[PDB]
Amino acid sequence: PKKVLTGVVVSDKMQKTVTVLVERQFPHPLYGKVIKRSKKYLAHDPEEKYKLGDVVEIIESRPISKRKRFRVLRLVESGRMDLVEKYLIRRQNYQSLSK
Amino acid sequence: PTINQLVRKGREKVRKKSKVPALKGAPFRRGVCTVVRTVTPKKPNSALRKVAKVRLTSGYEVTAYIPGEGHNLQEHSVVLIRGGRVKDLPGVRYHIVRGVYDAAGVKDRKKSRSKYGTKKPK
Amino acid sequence: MLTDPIADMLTRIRNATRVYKESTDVPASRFKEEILRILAREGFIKGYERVDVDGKPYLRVYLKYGPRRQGPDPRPEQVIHHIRRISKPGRRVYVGVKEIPRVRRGLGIAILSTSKGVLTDREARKLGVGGELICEVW
Amino acid sequence: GRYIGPVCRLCRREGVKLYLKGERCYSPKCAMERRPYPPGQHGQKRARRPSDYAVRLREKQKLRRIYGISERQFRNLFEEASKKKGVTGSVFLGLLESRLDNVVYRLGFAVSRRQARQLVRHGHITVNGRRVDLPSYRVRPGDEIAVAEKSRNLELIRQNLEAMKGRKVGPWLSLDVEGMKGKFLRLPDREDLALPVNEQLVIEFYSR
Amino acid sequence: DFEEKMILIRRTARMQAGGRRFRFGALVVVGDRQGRVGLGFGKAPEVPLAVQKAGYYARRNMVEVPLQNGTIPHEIEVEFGASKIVLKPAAPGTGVIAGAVPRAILELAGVTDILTKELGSRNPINIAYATMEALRQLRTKADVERLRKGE
RNA sequence: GGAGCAAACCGGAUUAGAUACCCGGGUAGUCCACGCCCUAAACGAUGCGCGCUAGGUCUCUGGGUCUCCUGGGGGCCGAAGCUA
RNA sequence: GUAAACUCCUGAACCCGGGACGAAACCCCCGAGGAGGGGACUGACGGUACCGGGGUAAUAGCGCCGGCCAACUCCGUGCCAGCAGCCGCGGUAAUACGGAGGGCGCGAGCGUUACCCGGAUUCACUGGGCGUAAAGGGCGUGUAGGCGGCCUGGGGCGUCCCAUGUGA
């Protein structure tokens, strides 16, 4: 199978490409408590139909950049700006631990 | 800690320091003597103990004990040390193996003999 | 602010039995009522009751003990000495059916919510099911 | 010698004779009959209470000298029954009482078991077909323990087998007499063979 | 019919104007090796007196023990103040795998197969007390089906 | 800003000595405005939220049917339990 | 210490004799350069493994012995000589030093050093703590995160079961 993953748009500042937040979760290898992990995927968008905050999902495919290996398979949810707001915020934090 | 705290900061393994660093992972290192002298034990013992400063193959320069009923050793004696601390000699963490190299094993021992480079007599 | 209701229930009883009480109540839950029912129809306590405190639902749980002792402490034997959450809101605990644990070598038991319902180990062994490990008791 | 030395003494330490020596150790003449007390410049002296190490060990050494075998050989077999799916105590005996140099013994072919080893390592015995000469052969049930040719008429054969006519051997090794043989029957039970050793103790010592 | 077993025994002092003034203690167990036991701590100015002072002590104070075949039914563990001891029942042909002190209990109870482990303060005195209270709390399939067999 | 007090300082004494304790002086400082510093035995040597598990009395503050019940604070004994 | 001596018995070694398996197929011939069939060659190890006979009483060490830790006396020595893994032993009556007698344990090995886990529930998920033993942030506000009451109902990512591929 080609892997199919699911995430939220966070970048349409790229021509014909979109970044998406593929969260994932599993139980801890020693401590049982399940954990959630995240990994931004660069996903090709043939006609930048997809806008920000869209909950869509990707598709394993042939390389079309240095980093694009996936495309949008199909949109599902839409206008989910709360989520972009919660990850944009995560970065906003960063410029504060610096020295 | 709570499991989450645990998840985050995690437990932490601790390493043992190798109490015989001059070995450099070996079982023994060769070397020469620079000085053979006697030296008093700390509290609460008293006796002139025989030691040796040994300049090593490993570029080192360490202190070592000479066990036995007297010894021959003088400076420039090719020699060999193995791990082993003396309790009441602060600092000494190595013993010269009697018998190998220019440090040959003690005369006229018969009991516990193999630990002192003496052959079996007949 | 009340994290977990189940463990508080499981402990509400505990405090109440070690001081040797008649009954006790607990914020009624459809799910909770099943745990109780296992403990109830295990013979582990007398029973619970569809009770209602001040227009808010509760379950009057009726406790079990044993005969007067003889020693300087006539204080009765216990029916349910031990009880604790296995899984916690902190770290949840899911198990396979291959990995269900024997309790007190069968003396006591363990409950677990399964995809079919709340069961005990051998119940859940027999339906051959995994689940969330709610408690060990004896 | 690796174990070949002064022997009807060992028991003086053990405090219970291994009935060791062969014919002599049945006679009012065994070291333990005449002078029963630990050897050496003491032993005539009393006894401080034996600690659990002393305890657990001294039953081990007994059992070890009952077959006169080396620790490296001994250690193996013990660990083996602990691995083997079953009751270690009984089974461990179930290997000892299965060594050929021991089967030769309990079939009465030889006097003291120490003697028996020699006969073994001289092809004087042949299990089933060809001759064996391994002391440590783990004999199997249903096997045929025989006696060779430059042997079948030899002295101690004659002499020692003479006594086995009349003698009732263990309930697990049917001895034919003067036909020079016997079949190892079943793997012998715990009860089946009595030794002056509570072997459960030997389990503890090792498993330390 | 009975049977003794003389555990650790100690000299302790009590400084009075004259000099470091001594006395002795003595830990001990009596056993029948088929289901009953008892532990007794005795204290008198002399070794064997305090020894067989713990004589009467070990015999009066007592308790049963439900060794099934040659082992306890359910494992338990016990913190006594802060000195913990665990004990899991064992399959036949296993033996007293246990500390010095726990062994003294279980041989005189009659236990053979048993796996144990001392945690916390391994001070032998309390461990003994711990191991007793442990053997007090053991139950059997009948013991439960009397308090789930509701009258 | 500066009355009292008071490190530093000065003198007196006490002592073997007294750069100290006790005494006669005395400046920063102690007070105000504004701005820094950010430590402490910053202690209940006891992180914050919630639910449960006997009572006895001594108070602080509410509401009542201000009897002596119903809330919220502060103290002391003390069941159970915990505690080396 | 039955230890020896000695009596009797065996017969490692050692000489002799004989002597492999491992190798049936490439090839040739019947046939159809095919099935099937039949015939032939080839052993480095190696005169080895081994089987048969003659046959001699044939090396034993190293560690330890105050406690943990099994095993004790005599002497020499006098905080010297030295031992020691911790605790410690030795300053004229030392089971701890060195010799010995004996004892203990393993045995063609016994010690020693070095290294890894172990014991170390002493980084604790299993499995610890923080009033006085090392440990509560001086106190608040709140970002991210972590966690979160009761009752329907939908999906079924977690979780679960079955079959299956896979896990050489």
Add this chain to the structure above:
RNA sequence: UAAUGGCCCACCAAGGCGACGACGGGUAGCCGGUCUGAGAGGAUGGCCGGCCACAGGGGCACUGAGACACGGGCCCCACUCCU
């Protein structure tokens, strides 16, 4: 190029990444398995089998189905001998 690709050019846009630890430093061939431990864990990759990378250090291409090739070629450093 056998083939997807900032693999490489061109020209355009201005983005990509980071406390779920980017970037920098130190260390290391990885695995089947091995050692240990009651286990959970801890430690470990020599024999042997699977993959990787190199052949005194560094580049580079030609031949070829396959190499950028220990016992092939070219060039630069080091080393060794022939003259």
